[PDB]
Ligand binder design. Structure first.
Ligand SMILES: O=C(O)c1ccc(-c2cn[nH]c2)nc1
Length: 256
């Protein structure tokens, strides 16, 4: 089962702050693997069952997916203090990694990350799961050549127009938000619309404006991004198709 005995967990260095509390790395001592490196999400306010409810929904949902580019649940400890134990991605959240690895990562690698992300989102799409919070900050880096979707759950600057005007969230909103994430990656983790009032962002989308083509970004990728940003959700592509196009973009980039 998925409940874990606190005695098999050795808490270690704090590796990040989450919505609910500190995120730690640590060791999980099971009989199947005597020393498994894990991540531990903690829940600062989980004495409140309303918080505990929302915190542990993340683990109930993780548990349903099996993809190579989606983080995996190990187990939970539900007595206080409540903990989620999940796979460790030792290079942390994608945004910081992009920031710190600027000048160090090449183009093929940035494309590799977007294509990897699209395969995770095509998989979720095939399961009819809407994610609603696709952003570089919600992706983790397992290795120089492997990123993973780390969260499932306001980010106006990332959201589709119909999310903002009708609070509506669909596979097509996800596609839109994934265009923004691709932009974020080709900009090495610069946030979209920096220094722009949220409320002014919506008018500019309605005005037809869009995020600029990043430097060093290929026309083929920018064209992909702009299809993701069709104002009408029914003109935007499906991740299955985005996945296939990014596969071609990557094979050709590898060729230089
Ligand atoms: O700061 C965070 O929210 C954060 C940081 C790290 C991780 C992680 C999970 N597995 N490996 C790393 N999750 C969330």
């Amino acid at each position: 089962d998925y409940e874990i005995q606190r005695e098999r967990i050795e808490l270690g260095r704090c590796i990040g702050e989450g919505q609910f509390g500190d995120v730690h790395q640590g060791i999980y001592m099971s009989p199947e693997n005597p020393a498994l490196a894990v991540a531990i999400k903690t829940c600062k306010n989980c004495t409140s069952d309303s918080v505990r409810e929302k915190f542990l929904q993340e683990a109930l949902t993780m548990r349903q997916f099996d993809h190579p580019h989606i983080v995996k649940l190990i187990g939970v400890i539900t007595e206080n203090p409540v903990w989620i134990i999940m796979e460790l991605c030792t290079l942390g959240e994608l945004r910081s990694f992009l920031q710190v690895r600027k000048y160090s990562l090449d183009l093929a690698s940035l494309i590799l990350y977007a294509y990897q992300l699209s395969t995770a989102l095509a998989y979720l799409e095939s399961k009819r799961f809407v994610h609603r919070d696709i952003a570089a900050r919600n992706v983790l880096v397992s290795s120089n050549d492997c990123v993973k979707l780390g969260d499932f759950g306001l980010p106006i600057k990332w959201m589709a127009p119909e999310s903002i005007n009708f609070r509506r969230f669909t596979s097509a909103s996800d596609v839109w938000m994934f265009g923004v994430c691709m932009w974020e990656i080709l900009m090495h983790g610069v946030k979209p619309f920096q220094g722009v009032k949220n409320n002014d962002v919506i008018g500019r989308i309605e005005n037809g404006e869009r995020l600029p083509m990043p430097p060093n970004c290929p026309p083929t990728l920018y064209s992909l991004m702009t299809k993701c940003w069709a104002y009408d959700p029914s003109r935007r592509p499906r991740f299955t198709e985005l996945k296939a196009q990014l596969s071609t973009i990557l094979e050709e980039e590898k060729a230089q």
